[PDB]
Amino acid sequence: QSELDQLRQEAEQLKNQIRDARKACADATLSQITNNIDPVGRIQMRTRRTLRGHLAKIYAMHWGTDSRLLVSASQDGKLIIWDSYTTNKVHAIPLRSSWVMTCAYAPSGNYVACGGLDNICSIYNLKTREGNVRVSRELAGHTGYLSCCRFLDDNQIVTSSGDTTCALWDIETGQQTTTFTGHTGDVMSLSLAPDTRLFVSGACDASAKLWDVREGMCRQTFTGHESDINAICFFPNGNAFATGSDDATCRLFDLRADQELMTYSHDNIICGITSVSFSKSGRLLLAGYDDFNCNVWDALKADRAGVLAGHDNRVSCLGVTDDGMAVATGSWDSFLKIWN
Amino acid sequence: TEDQRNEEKAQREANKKIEKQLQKDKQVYRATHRLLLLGAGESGKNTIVKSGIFETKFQVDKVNFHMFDVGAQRDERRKWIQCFNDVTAIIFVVASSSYNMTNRLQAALKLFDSIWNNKWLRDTSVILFLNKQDLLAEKVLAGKSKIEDYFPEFARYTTPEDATPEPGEDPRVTRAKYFIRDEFLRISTASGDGRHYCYPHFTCSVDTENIRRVFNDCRDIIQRMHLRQYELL
């Protein structure tokens, strides 16, 4: 077909034009801008708590907005809300499907969400209407496994699925209000902007897309990774984000410059990144790895600052408290560790 | 600070209740063998078992089995297959009557090879079901389809001396069966160390002994892992 041939020709011409436009803005690199900045030094965090009680491996955790409570999901079919200060378990929610792959805590603290190989995102009412915790709403639109979910607020949640789509939900109606399409592979993670007006998603096509929540369209597409992107997180400023992929590298992309700023990799690292997160100031990039450690990276320089080596199996999730007080890591050894 | 002490006491009581429930949950979890039923759409696994994932529970010799069949998922598996690293066994169902009808047998071989060599699945055993034995037998007896057309090594392949065939079986049917089985076992033994094992099984889509085969294979897997914990094997 000549129509398909000329459409592909136009697409590659547009890609070349975009590449030229991005190249013209690369007057200098971030590495040489922050060359005179003093190094962060050596970061040595100790394990302060070890949360035990999960029977199987843990895929997801999410810190509460109060920086004290967190929720974790394990393949045994359990959601546990922990009191990280006292290591006491607050709730232990049995799941209808044991193949959970993600969990989200609501910013208000009234709800938790989970999903997985069953394509349903389940919302749980934490606050005691009568005393117990039960399923509040099930969202069954997706045709693939649920990989990530994040509450915009109460009654709004964004979910990424293996059907290569992201969706925006209304909890009371249970219906999708917006569908975000354009990824050609499984969407593995999403991160909400601080203002909750935009969110980025990393997929198995080695691409990250910046979406508009209100308009439901892809504003920008970021490339540069070589394998499936497993993790994504905004810089605390909101004008940048970091990704972690199976190609054993972490990359920092700038929204306004519309390109890559820095790559975080070492020759001794040949395993993929499963989770990334920033510190409170964004100076440190924390990445979990297929090998059982976590690496602390300088954000403004491409040099490692410290290592979190406490886990006996794959590190599957990590997160930093809203106040930056501590970082928690989940792992396939069925333990959560609080680092400080 | 008495209010703080009361809150701590209440939190401790709630934690104690949660741990007491978790003990029973752990006891239930350890006494159940989870199984991942995997195969092609026309491999016959739909009759064998007779929503993102389907679930069926069957009890054999008072032992609980929990077998999961993957439903509404895309054909890309490299991400959600990692959820079954700690499963007791992966039941792989292959249509033996597909060496020509789209080389489906080669696709099944590639899928098995990918499962075998995956880093997160390098400790999970595979119960292999070479299904549709009657259809393969009738196709071999008919002679219309030649296996050597799509597997050139079949011409120079001889039935193994340890092969035990059924009484009323054509030697050609037995040779084809064991050729497919050895095609799978070549991948199984190429890099399959003592961590995980393969259990070939010439089965029909409707066999009353399939649950017995699964039970025996799971018992063997558990016994082997126990013996390896003691470094006896």
Partner: nanobody, 128 residues
Framework: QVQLQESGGGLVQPGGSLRLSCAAS????????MNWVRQAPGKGLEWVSD????????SYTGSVKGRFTISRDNAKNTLYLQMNSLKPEDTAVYYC?????????????????????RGQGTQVTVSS
């Protein structure tokens, strides 16, 4: 941007010879295992051949064994497929597909209907 452009296909007589090349960019070529996948008209994607990172481990499908020769050049970031004895059943669109992850031995989803890390394809037609 991971790009794979394959060129070399075209009309060829039965028993003829064709050479398929695959120019790769956007990733470290030497770290990945390459594959060749074809789609016959009216049928699904069928795996053909693969070659390891160093090129010391080569596998073929039975239909083309002894006829096709896969080869890779890590310095030039190029993947090759030599065709020697073409048949009318060899008429298909041939795709240059890359394994999802580096340094791995398993190669999942390489023949998926909508699978990234695969080229647009080059048409090979065998007729008279």
């Amino acid at each position: 941007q991971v790009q794979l452009q394959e060129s070399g296909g075209g009309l060829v007589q039965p028993g003829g010879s064709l050479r398929l090349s695959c120019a790769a960019s956007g990733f470290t070529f030497s770290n990945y295992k390459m594959n060749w996948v074809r789609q016959a008209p009216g049928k699904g994607l069928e795996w053909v051949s693969d070659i390891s990172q160093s090129g010391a481990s080569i596998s073929y499908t039975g239909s083309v064994k002894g006829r096709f020769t896969i080869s890779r050049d890590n310095a030039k970031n190029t993947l090759y497929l030599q065709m020697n004895s073409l048949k009318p059943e060899d008429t298909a669109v041939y795709y240059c597909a890359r394994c999802p992850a580096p340094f791995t031995r398993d190669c999942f989803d390489v023949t998926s209907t909508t699978y990234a890390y695969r080229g647009q394809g080059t048409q090979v037609t065998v007729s008279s």
